[PDB]
Design a protein around this ligand. Structure first.
Ligand SMILES: O=C(O)CNC(=O)C(=O)O
Ligand SMILES: [Mg+2]
Ligand code: NI
Ligand SMILES: [Zn+2]
Length: 331
């Protein structure tokens, strides 16, 4: 079995190997990359996502989210407070202000220590889930706006034609902006490209150990657990690496820098934080190996997680028994 310790693998494809996305994901899995739940892909030196970032300040963040923490340093929840719209130029100026900027630090490890010691005492503002793409339409390789769709994958594998579309989203981050512990909708893969700026630290639990994370989360957030059998779908729970170690949860960590891709694998729980002002683009995707994860994926039926038009059809075809009760939570 490849990668039995479930380490995060880092790949360095050639420009020739960067031409066929599906075949390279399949290659990564042949090397055991999926066992970690997360892999890093450094693009070939000749590749570029676009020519420059000079003209991005007029993108609008229509609903910036202030992330307000509650709890103890190692175990907290966050809620998202809606703020007034601002442009990317405005947001970058805010990220760089004395109140919100990245503090002095020695290295990524010192900064991680400061995050966990200090995250809960601050409320950073995140521009999340903005529909759109920063890939140049003439970038042919690994262009997240030109991938094959999950709906076409389901048609090719299962023969059924469904409604829905699959498009990318932009994330503008600042120091301490946080992604809570989650797997993707319907336990899909995700791919994430850090277009510019400061890094993003990721934590991940191997898919084969996801249930151990879930069990700890039920113990750590007991009221949440009673309210919904899949409350991690709400994307509000943070658990520090120290707390995971104290409870014997297997995980790994890695820092993504500008110009690198991360891929999350089906049922790979992940969480993390941004080091400073940055802009990432991400999209979900499927492969043939995903189908069985999609069939088994948990769902939020308390109604909090409230998900896309396209996810309907996935639940409808792959989880027909759930379909009824799940759409009661989504309507
Ligand atoms: O970039 C972020 O804030 C979070 N991204 C992901 O969870 C992802 O790409 O799967
Ligand atoms: Mg602009
Ligand atoms: Ni994710
Ligand atoms: Zn729920």
């Amino acid at each position: 079995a490849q990668n039995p310790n479930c380490n995060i693998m880092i790949f360095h494809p050639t420009k020739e190997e960067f031409n066929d996305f599906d075949k390279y994901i399949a290659y990564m899995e042949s090397q055991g990359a999926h066992r970690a739940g997360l892999a890093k892909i450094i693009p070939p030196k000749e590749w570029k996502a676009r020519e420059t970032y000079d003209n991005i300040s007029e993108i609008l963040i229509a609903t910036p989210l202030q992330q307000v923490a509650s709890g103890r340093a190692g175990v907290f929840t966050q809620y998202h407070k809606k703020k007034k719209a601002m442009t990317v130029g405005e947001y970058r100026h805010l990220a760089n202000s004395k109140k919100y900027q990245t503090p002095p630090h020695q290295n990524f490890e010192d900064l991680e220590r400061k995050y966990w010691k200090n995250r809960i005492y601050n409320s950073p503002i995140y521009g999340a889930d903005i529909s759109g793409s920063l890939f140049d339409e003439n970038t042919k390789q690994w262009n997240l706006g030109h991938l094959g769709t999950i709906q076409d994958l389901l048609e090719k594998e299962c023969g059924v034609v469904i409604e829905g579309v699959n498009t990318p989203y932009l994330y503008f981050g600042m120091w301490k902006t946080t992604f809570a512990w989650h797997t993707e909708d319907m336990d899909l893969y995700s791919i994430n490209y850090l277009h510019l700026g400061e890094p993003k630290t990721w934590y991940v639990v191997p898919p084969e150990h996801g249930q151990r994370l879930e069990r700890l989360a039920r113990e750590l957030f007991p009221g949440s657990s009673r309210g919904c059998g899949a409350f991690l779908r709400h994307k509000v729970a943070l658990i520090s690496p120290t707390v995971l170690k104290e409870n014997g949860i297997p995980f790994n960590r890695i820092t993504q820098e500008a110009g690198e891709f991360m891929v999350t694998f089906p049922y790979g729980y992940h969480a993390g934080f941004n080091h400073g002002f940055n802009c990432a683009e991400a999209i979900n995707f499927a492969t043939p190996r995903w189908i069985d994860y999609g069939k088994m994926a948990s769902q939020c039926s308390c109604g909090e997680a409230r998900v896309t038009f396209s996810m309907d059809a996935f639940v409808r075809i792959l989880q027909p028994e759930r379909y009824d009760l799940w759409k009661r939570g989504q309507d």
